[PDB]
Ligand binder design. Structure first.
Ligand SMILES: Cc1cc(CNc2ncc(Br)c(Nc3cc(CCc4ccccc4)n[nH]3)n2)on1
Ligand SMILES: Cc1cc(CNc2ncc(Br)c(Nc3cc(CCc4ccccc4)n[nH]3)n2)on1
Lengths: 279, 279
C-alpha cells in the first residue's frame, strides 16, 4: 500500500474508458501533464481536461506526493480562480489526476506574448482574479509558499487559475529565474511562511503583471538580494503602471507582515480599481 | 619651481584659506577668500585645490596638467571655471569657482521627500539641460570627460550645475565607476564624445532617481554580462517615457546611433519648456 493498489474514492473515480489521453502539455509538480478528452465528469458531453500522472522514472515517494496533492485538492473545494480537481483514475493502472484545462498556458508566458493586446482594465482584472483565488486558498488554510506568474494558468476565456495548493536558494527555473525573488524577508531569512508572506509574493506577482511578464531584480545574485531587502530597497514602478497600483505593491512589500494588507483587503481594493479602470 | 603665468597668478597674501570642503581629483579642496580677483578691495569666496601632504611627483604633474587644461578650455556657466593660481614660493594653489551646494548626487538625495526643499519635475529637467550644455561646451573644445557622473557635477548657491574634472575600485559612497562607462570604454578602453553620451544617460537616471545608485545589487562581472546581452536599467519610478527613451538612446550599443550633446541640449531645452513646475 500503495505498492500494488491505491484505495478507492467513488466520489472522484472515472472509468478509464471515459478518458482519451492526448498531447503532452508539459512537466508539472510531481509528474507530467497531458491534454485529454473526458466523457461526462459532472453526462454525454466531452470536456477537454488536463491529466497529471507520474513519469516512467518515478519512485514510491513521487507517487505518495501525487496522491497527497490529489487528496489536498479534494479538501480545498471549488473556486473559479484555482485549477479545480475534476476526477481521478486510481484503480487498475497508473494514477491519473484529472483537472481543469487552461489552454493559454502560464500567466508569465501569456503576458509576454501580449507585449507591444492587453488593456489597463485586463491587467487589473488579471490581478483581481489572482487575489480572489489567493483569498479562497487562504480561507482553506492553504499557504502557497510559491506565488509567481508562472504558477498561474490562463484558460481559453482568459480566467486566471492558480496552480499551487532544506529548501534551495540558488536553484533556477526553466526561464532561468530564482524563486527567492518572490519570497518575503521573514520566509527568506527565518523560514516563516504565512498568508502575509504570500501577500509579499502577490506584490511581486503584481509587478510581473504590470511589466507584462518582466523579470524581477535582473542580474541581482541571491546574496545581493538579501542586502537590498535588508536595506529596505524595493523594485521600481513599472512603466505605465498607476501610482495607486504601485502603492498596493509597496504595501504588499512592507517589512512588518502585520502592516501588509490581507488577501481580503486586496480583493476589495482590486474589485473597486477594476470598475474604475478604463479598457 | 613652476614657471610664472601673469594671466592667472594671484599674490599669496590675497588669499585667506578657510575651512576644508573635501577631497577632489589630484588633491584636497578648501574654501577661501580672495582679495581683489577682478575692485581690488572686494573679497570673493573661492575653492582652492592643493596637494595632500602625502602627494607624489605624479600627483603634482597631474594637478599642474588639470590647471593647464582649464586655462585652455575657456569660460562656460556650466563648468567649474579657473579663477587664478599661486604657483611661486610655496605650495601650488589652483583657485576656482566655489559651488556651495556640493556635488549633484548629494544635492538630489538631500531633496528627496522625507533635508532640503523638494525639486519639481521642471527643476530636474533643467538640471539635466545644464549638464548637457556644459558637456556640449566641453565637446566643442575637443574635450572628452571620461568620468561624467552626478558626483562630478557641483551645484552653486544659485542652483547652477557645474561640471568638474574634465574595475573593482569603489568611491567614498561605495559605487563602482564602471557603472557609468560605455561598453566600448569598459572593454576596449575607447573613450569618445559618444562614450560620454552613454555616461550622460546614466547621469539622467541618477537625476530621475534623485541620486539613486546605478544597477543596485549588480556585481562588476554581472554588469559585463547584462551589457553584452543588451540589458539596460529600468525606467526610474518618477520619469516620463520621453525622458526614458532619451536615456535608452544614450545607451545605444552602436556609439554612432547615440544622440550627440548638441541634440541632447535641443531636446532638453524643448522638454524643460513643456515640463510643469507644479509637481
Ligand atoms: C503550472 C503548471 C503548468 C503545467 C503543465 N504545463 C502546461 N503547459 C502548457 C499548458 Br496550455 C498547460 N495547461 C494546463 C495545465 C493544467 C493543470 C496542471 C495541474 C495543476 C495543478 C494540479 C494538477 C495539475 N491545466 N491546463 N500546462 O502544470 N502546472
Ligand atoms: C567634484 C569635487 C568635489 C570636490 C571637493 N569637495 C567639496 N565638498 C563640498 C563642497 Br560645498 C565643494 N564645493 C566646491 C568644490 C569646488 C571645486 C573643486 C575643484 C575642481 C577642479 C579643480 C579645482 C577644484 N568648488 N566648490 N567641494 O572637489 N571636486
Amino acid at each position: 500500500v500503495s505498492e500494488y493498489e491505491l484505495p478507492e474514492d467513488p466520489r472522484w473515480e472515472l472509468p478509464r474508458d471515459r478518458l482519451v489521453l492526448g498531447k503532452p502539455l508539459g512537466e508539472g509538480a510531481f509528474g507530467q501533464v497531458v491534454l485529454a478528452e473526458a466523457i461526462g465528469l459532472d453526462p454525454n458531453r466531452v470536456t477537454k481536461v488536463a491529466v497529471k500522472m507520474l513519469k516512467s522514472d518515478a519512485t514510491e515517494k513521487d507517487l505518495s506526493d501525487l496522491i497527497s496533492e490529489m487528496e489536498m485538492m479534494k479538501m480545498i473545494g471549488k473556486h473559479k480562480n484555482i485549477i479545480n480537481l475534476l476526477g481521478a483514475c486510481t484503480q487498475d493502472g497508473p494514477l491519473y489526476v484529472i483537472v481543469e484545462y487552461a489552454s493559454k498556458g502560464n500567466l508569465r508566458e501569456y503576458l509576454q506574448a501580449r507585449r507591444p493586446q492587453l488593456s489597463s482594465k485586463d491587467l487589473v482584472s488579471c490581478a483581481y482574479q489572482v487575489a480572489r483565488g489567493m483569498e479562497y486558498l487562504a480561507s482553506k488554510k492553504c499557504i502557497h509558499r510559491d506565488l509567481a506568474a508562472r504558477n498561474v494558468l490562463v484558460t481559453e476565456d482568459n480566467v486566471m487559475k492558480i496552480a499551487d495548493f532544506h529548501i534551495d536558494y540558488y536553484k533556477k527555473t526553466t526561464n532561468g529565474r530564482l524563486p527567492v525573488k518572490w519570497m518575503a524577508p521573514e520566509a527568506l531569512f527565518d523560514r516563516i511562511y504565512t498568508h502575509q508572506s504570500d501577500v509579499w509574493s502577490f506584490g511581486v506577482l503584481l509587478w510581473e503583471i504590470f511589466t507584462l511578464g518582466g523579470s524581477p531584480y535582473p542580474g541581482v545574485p541571491v546574496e545581493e538580494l538579501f542586502k537590498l531587502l535588508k536595506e529596505g530597497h524595493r523594485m521600481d514602478k513599472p512603466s505605465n503602471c498607476t501610482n495607486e497600483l504601485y502603492m498596493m505593491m509597496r504595501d504588499c512589500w512592507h517589512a512588518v507582515p502585520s502592516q501588509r494588507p490581507t488577501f481580503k483587503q486586496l480583493v476589495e481594493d482590486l474589485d473597486r480599481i477594476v470598475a474604475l479602470t478604463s479598457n
